[PDB]
A and B are shown apart, each in its own frame.
Chain A
């Protein structure tokens, strides 16, 4: 849930 979005680069 409540997680800050990570850099799209790591996905």
Chain B
């Protein structure tokens, strides 16, 4: 995360780290959506132009974490994967359309002060909250600039109107994406970056005071560049698929 700050303890208890077994290293961010399901970006798992195709046995999820590198004894929980589910129309060939995947845990994780699931939006909350100017929050242990942080980082960012999103890039943008970030002249700045992939963009509903995950960190050209914006998978748009997968697995 660029130009964010250190997270508070327990501030993002749904934050998950995708972790490589060998060599042991951070791979991506992710989120806890129930005691046995984790949500992440498909490109965290499958990206053939980079010869990336991870399978369950390559990976672990670490839940309840604050520090990036430390093993947080008596606090984090580490979980093995039962099954990875990738959107079948995930478009890695062109623009990362439908950049979303689910991971089912071998065994359920125990909730705690540091481990708790995020809500997924209903159509009304989404319609309510996904407006230009409305700020969400993104969290991650990724790059601090275009080194790496000691603890989880947090940054709040405004949703950007779709024509400005579209006009900032040569990529073909879809309804399954949204973009977020300050405009060059808006003064403030901040962005997700390499390593933040698959982590959540969340919003706090003013109607019932719960946190909802509206987005997944997906792509961007550079990090925190003027006139460029971070792009996020639109979780509500793909909820149908989400519900199917969980409903039948």
Contacts and interface: CB of A to CB of B under 8 A. Distances in A.
In the complex, are there CB atoms of A and B closer than 8 Å? Answer: yes
Interface of A: 1-7, 10-11
Interface residues of B, number: 12
Interface string B62-83: 0000000111000000101000
Interface of B: 19, 21-22, 24-26, 60, 69-71, 78, 80
B78 A6 contact: yes
A6 to B, nearest CB: 5
Nearest to B25: A3
Interface secondary structure of A, over-half rule: loop
A2 B70 CA distance: 9
B71 A4 contact: yes
Contact of B69 (A2, A7, A10, A11): A2
Contacts of B21: 11
A3 B80 CA distance: 18
B25 A5 contact: no
A5 B71 CA distance: 7
Contacts of B78: 6-7, 10
B75 to A, nearest CB: 13
Contacts of A7: 71, 78
B71 A6 contact: yes
A5 B69 CA distance: 9
Given A4-B69, A6-B78, A10-B80, 17 more contacts: A2-B69, A3-B24, A3-B26, A3-B69, A4-B70, A4-B71, A5-B24, A5-B71, A6-B19, A6-B24, A6-B60, A7-B71, A10-B60, A10-B78, A11-B21, A11-B22, A11-B60
A1 B70 contact: no
B30 to A, nearest CB: 16
A7 B70 CA distance: 12
A7 B78 CA distance: 10
A2 B80 CA distance: 22
B74 to A, nearest CB: 12
Contacts of B19: 6
Nearest to A1: B25
A3 B25 CA distance: 7
A2 B78 CA distance: 18
Contacts of A2: 69
A5 B70 CA distance: 8
A6 B60 CA distance: 11
